[PDB]
Amino acid sequence: MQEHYQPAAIEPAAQKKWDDARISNVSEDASKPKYYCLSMFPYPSGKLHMGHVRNYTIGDVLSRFKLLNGFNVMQPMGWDAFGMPAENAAMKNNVAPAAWTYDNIEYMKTQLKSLGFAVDWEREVATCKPEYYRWEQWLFTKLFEKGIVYRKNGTVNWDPVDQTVLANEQVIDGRGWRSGALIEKREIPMYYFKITDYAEELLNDLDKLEHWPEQVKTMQRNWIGKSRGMTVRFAVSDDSKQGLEGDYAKFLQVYTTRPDTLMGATYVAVAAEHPLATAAAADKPELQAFIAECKEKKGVPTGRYVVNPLNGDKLEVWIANYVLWGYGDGAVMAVPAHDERDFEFAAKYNLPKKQVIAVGDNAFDANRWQEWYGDKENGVLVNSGDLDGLDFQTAFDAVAAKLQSQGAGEPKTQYRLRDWGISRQRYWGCPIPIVHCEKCGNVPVPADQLPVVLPENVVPDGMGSPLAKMPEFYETSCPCCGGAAKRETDTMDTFIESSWYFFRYMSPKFSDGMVSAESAKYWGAVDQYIGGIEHAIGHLLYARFFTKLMRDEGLVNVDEPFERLLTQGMVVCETYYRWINPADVVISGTEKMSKSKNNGVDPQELINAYGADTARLFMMFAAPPEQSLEWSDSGVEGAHRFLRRLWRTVYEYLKQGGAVKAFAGNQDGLSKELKDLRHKLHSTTAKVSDDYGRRQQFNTAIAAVMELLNQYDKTDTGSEQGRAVAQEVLEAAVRLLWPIVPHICETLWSELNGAKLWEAGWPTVDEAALVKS
Ligand SMILES: CC(C)C[C@H](N)C(=O)OP(=O)(O)OC[C@H]1O[C@@H](n2cnc3c(N)ncnc32)[C@H](O)[C@@H]1O
Ligand SMILES: [Mg+2]
Ligand SMILES: [Zn+2]
């Protein structure tokens, strides 16, 4: 054993030792229990930095920990090759997207292999490969027939810089997720995933996720935005029916979020395009000027009356400029006494305010709005008949049974979740398998003729969809009739491949479907998922929706894709722009380590200067995995000094007697200072085993091993029994730190014990060494 700690010699040799052993290339071995640990797979938008290194190290620490405990661990690594992240980097460097992606894929693969992660590289996947995106094309066509995927025109978010439409989850604070430019609204036909059909299921199965951060679960609940309301039909008075015809001659439908205020409704609003408005304006030019006005808050009365179905009040129908047509049934009711917007609309034209809700005993001010009138949590009913005294949860249920008895209403549920538009006017993306025929229409591509191969030899000029300028691509024959037809030149979003890549890892070479029904049953769901919280509304929701699709198609049998979720904290560093890199202007301050700010420390520059063990140790020790981590060079130096201490500790031990048999069995006869050291040992083994697999607190697990070494240095171990205890302390330490730093621990383990480390396994707690003296 050399006296100096040389990472340049111990790390490549240990990586080859692991590669030759093939301890990460796992199959469906039924002997061991499975453990699917997954880290969010990166965008090939350039070189990885230490921020990604923390993400993938946190996953490696968990994967190596379970592996040491006799687990069949699958830690796979892939490349999120399609979409804007890679294509924008290709255009920024003036390179074809296919070339820039593949060359950066092979650089990022060598970046991760230098860090020595326990990755099953035989399961490596590139989303841009046709052997991959053919199956999301397959699922696209099968869902298109079922109507779950549909094409429709409408109002969409438009990115002027990225020159493409965006989904609602890709619009961050009214700006684009990749561009930051302000989003515009356009009328463009798109392909949508009917994610609203799964809105209720995506909301209830959230409670199943007991091992998800409650922040991620809460953000999804607000994004779905479920609200329970009431659809109320107001019978038009027999005199006010003159003019209307159809359903609008019988009743007028409204939706209200607070239907406990039904009796307190003093009037009713309507839209300008509503037939009840145009019929009342056929003889009134004062309303034909309002109908033509909007087509603030203004309103005109038309003498039309509807019947409040719960008390019989004859509420007049007002034409308002705030009732948007097409949204809902194009009409609402008005309760000014318990609605701020209706209080302003009624204090504007002097309309009644029959109070119906009390909050404890706050004196009701008639013409003074107060925040207690919208209290849907601490309110009973007044002046409502058989509703007086019922809370909102009871007043809702009583009004529902009341309206259903007359047939003038029923409860209705609404979500703020809109359908998922996936059409993109970009080149680098999965082609949409739809062929437009003038005779047949939008027909899907036959499954035998999949994939619709995206030509890789394209360099976008930067002015419009490049696929719409390639006749040799979009000119084809109709698969239904055989005539002239055009291919769909729009491509899918990058969040389509990332919504099922965790299943493709189970069978990356399977040529008959998305995932083999055999391996899908063996791996089940992802046991541990690690990735940034920025995907709580986008990817982490898209993945759950795609899983419920693939399940309802018969390809997988689980409901949720990820059991546990760990949103690791962001690594931060000072930034400079004019963007300038620290190792090479203005001072932007401490910011997230990102390529879009050029404050990223390259992992390869650190391994060349300190080694992979030093970089991984600094990431795991500087802070808990969920906490933000500030980059510190002294933190890098201190982590290296400890790895020197661990190396020098084993050297001086071996240089003073050589390897002996580690102490085991009954410890009576041992001295107190050695009984105390074995006590600290097995307290550390239990503390580390608990900080890894329960608390997931790696920094305090490293600190616990350091305290064990502090007591080892303070304990005299030169005797015959001291060496045996000293052999036990070091055999435990190099196995406890192995998930954090496997290169140095594998080297020191073989210098202490001839056996293979992973067959020695995780250190056990000798509880006899824990009892006090
Ligand atoms: C499933 C897919 C939609 C994932 C998508 N391809 C993606 O986000 O990929 P991207 O290549 O952007 O990053 C890969 C991973 O690295 C994390 N990450 C990035 N910067 C930092 C940082 N400063 N500190 C800590 N962690 C960081 C980031 O949260 C992500 O889990
Ligand atoms: Mg459960
Ligand atoms: Zn046809």
Per the CB < 8 A criterion, the answer to whether 302 and 281 are in contact is yes
Whether 707 is covered by a domain: the verdict is yes
Contact 371, 357 (CB under 8 A): no
Domain boundary pick from 395, 414, 433: 414
Secondary structure, 3-state, 232-268: EEEEECCCCCCCCCHHHHCEEEEEECCHHHCCCCCEE
Alpha carbon of 37 to ligand 2 centroid (Å):
18
Q: 541 in helix, strand or coil? A: helix
| SS3 state at 753 | coil
Q: Is residue 696 part of a domain?
A: yes
Residue 488 CA, chain-centre distance (Å), reads: 29
Ligand nearest to the CA of 495: 1
Ligand 1 probe mutation, 37, 53, 55, 502, most atoms within 8 A of CB: 55
Choose one of 39, 40, 41, 590 to mutate for the ligand 1 pocket test, by most ligand atoms within 8 angstroms of C-beta: 40
We report the CATH number of the domain holding residue 309 as 3.90.740.10
With CA atoms as reference, report the closest residue to 665 among 769, 736, 770.
769
The answer to whether the beta carbons of residues 11 and 614 sit under 8 Å apart is no
Question: Where on the phi/psi map is residue 123: left (φ > 0), alpha (ψ -120 to 50), or beta?
Answer: alpha
Interacting residues of 35 by C-beta distance below 8 A, sequence separation 6+:
63, 66, 67, 71, 72, 73, 74, 527, 528
Q: Which residue's CA is the nearest one to ligand 1's atom 7?
A: 42
Ligand sitting nearest the alpha carbon of 441: 3
Q: Does residue 561 contact residue 544 with C-beta atoms inside 8 Å?
A: yes
Q: Is the peptide bond before 466 cis (omega within 30 degrees of 0)?
A: no
CA of 149 from ligand 1 middle (Å) equals 29
Cα–Cα dist 175/158, whole Å = 10
Measured between alpha carbons, how far is 730 from 752 in angstroms, rounded to an integer?
8
Q: Is the dihedral of CA 503, 506, 508, 509 positive or negative?
A: negative
Q: Name the residue at shortest CA distance from atom 14 of ligand 1.
A: 42
> From CA 530, how far away is CA 51, in angstroms rounded?
13
Is residue 332 within 8 Å of residue 233, measured between CB atoms?
no
Cα–Cα distances (Å) from 326 to 250, 282, 331, 341, in that order, read 20, 22, 10, 20
Whether residue 210 lies inside any domain: the answer is no
Beta strand 314-320 with 267-270 is parallel
How far lies 764's CA from each of 67, 138, 316, 735, 742, in Å? 15, 49, 79, 11, 19
CA dist 214 to 210, 566, 597, 697, Å?
9, 11, 30, 18
Q: How far apart are alpha carbons 172 and 183 in whole angstroms? A: 9
142: CA distance to ligand 3 center in Å?
Answer: 19
Domain of 649, CATH number, reads 1.10.730.10
Among 528, 689, 616, which residue's Cα sits nearest to residue 63? 528
- CA distance linking residue 295 with residue 330, whole number of Å: 14
C-alpha neighbours within 13 Å on the C-beta side of residue 67: 27
Closest ligand 1 atom to residue 543 Cα is 1
Task: Using the structure block, give the residue that is written with the tokens 């722009």.
Answer: 577
Q: Whose CA is nearest to atom 22 of ligand 1?
A: 51
Residue 680 lies in a domain: yes
Separation of CA 196 and ligand 2 centre (Å): 25
Question: Beta strand pairing status for 484-487 and 434-437?
Answer: antiparallel
- What's the rounded Cα separation, in Å, for the pair 219 and 207? 13
- Nominal resolution (angstroms): 3.0
Rounded Cα gap, residues 76 and 78, in angstroms: 7
Number of neighbouring beta carbons within 10 Å of residue 155? 9
Q: Per DSSP, which regions of 438-524 are E strands?
A: 441-444, 475-477, 484-487
Q: Whose CA is nearest to atom 4 of ligand 1?
A: 40
User: Within a 10 A sphere around the Cβ of 126, how many other Cβ atoms?
Assistant: 18
Q: Among the atoms of ligand 1, which is closest to the Cα of residue 52?
A: 16
Instruction: Evaluate whether residue 663 is within a structural domain.
Output: yes
Question: Alpha-carbon Rg of the chain, whole angstroms?
Answer: 33
**Any idea which ligand is nearest the CA of 567?**
1
Going by their DSSP bridges, the two strands 357-358 and 171-172 should be labelled as: unpaired
| Ligand 1 neighbours (beta carbon < 6 A) | 40-43, 51-52, 54-55, 80, 498, 531-532, 535, 539, 568, 570-571, 592-594
Cα(311)–Cα(699) distance, rounded to whole angstroms? 66
Residue 256 lies in a domain: yes
> How far apart are alpha carbons 274 and 281 in whole angstroms?
11
CA atoms within 13 A on the CB side of 586: 8
Q: What is the Cα–Cα distance from 350 to 353, expressed in whole angstroms? A: 9
Q: How far is CA 302 from CA 95, 124, 233, 370, 561, in A?
A: 65, 69, 19, 31, 56
Distance 39 CA to ligand 1 centre (A): 9
How many A from CA of 558 to the centre of ligand 3? 38
Q: Return the number of other C-beta atoms located less than 10 Å from residue 741's C-beta.
A: 27
Residue with CA at minimum distance from ligand 1 atom 18 = 52
Per DSSP, the chain holds a count of helices (H) and strands (E) of 23, 30
Ligand 1, atom 13: closest residue by C-alpha: 42
Cα 487 to Cα 613: distance, rounded to the nearest angstrom = 51
What is the rounded CA–CA span in Å between residue 301 and residue 51?
Answer: 62
The residue from 414, 430, 452 where one domain ends is 414
Instruction: Give the closest ligand to the alpha carbon of residue 481.
Output: 3
Full DSSP string of 360-429 = TT----TTS--GGGG-SSS-EE-SSSTTTT--HHHHHHHHHHHHHHHTSEEEEEE-SPPPEE--B--SSS
**545 close to 143: Cβ distance less than 8 angstroms:** no
Q: At what angle do helices 633-654 and 612-621 cross, to 10 degrees?
A: 120
If you take atom 6 of ligand 1, which residue's CA is the nearest one?
42
CA of 191 to the centre of ligand 3 (A): 20
Residue ending a domain, choose from 414, 434, 461: 414
In a domain, 650, yes or no: yes
Nearest ligand, CA 44: 1
Question: What are 78's strand-pairing partners?
Answer: 125
Which atom belonging to ligand 1 lies closest to the Cα atom of 570? Answer: 24
Residue 487 Cα, ligand 3 centroid: separation in angstroms?
A: 12
Method: X-ray
Residue 727 lies in a domain: yes
- Domain, as residue range, for 649: 615-625+633-769
| Domain count across the chain | 2
Residues annotated within a binding site for ATP: 595
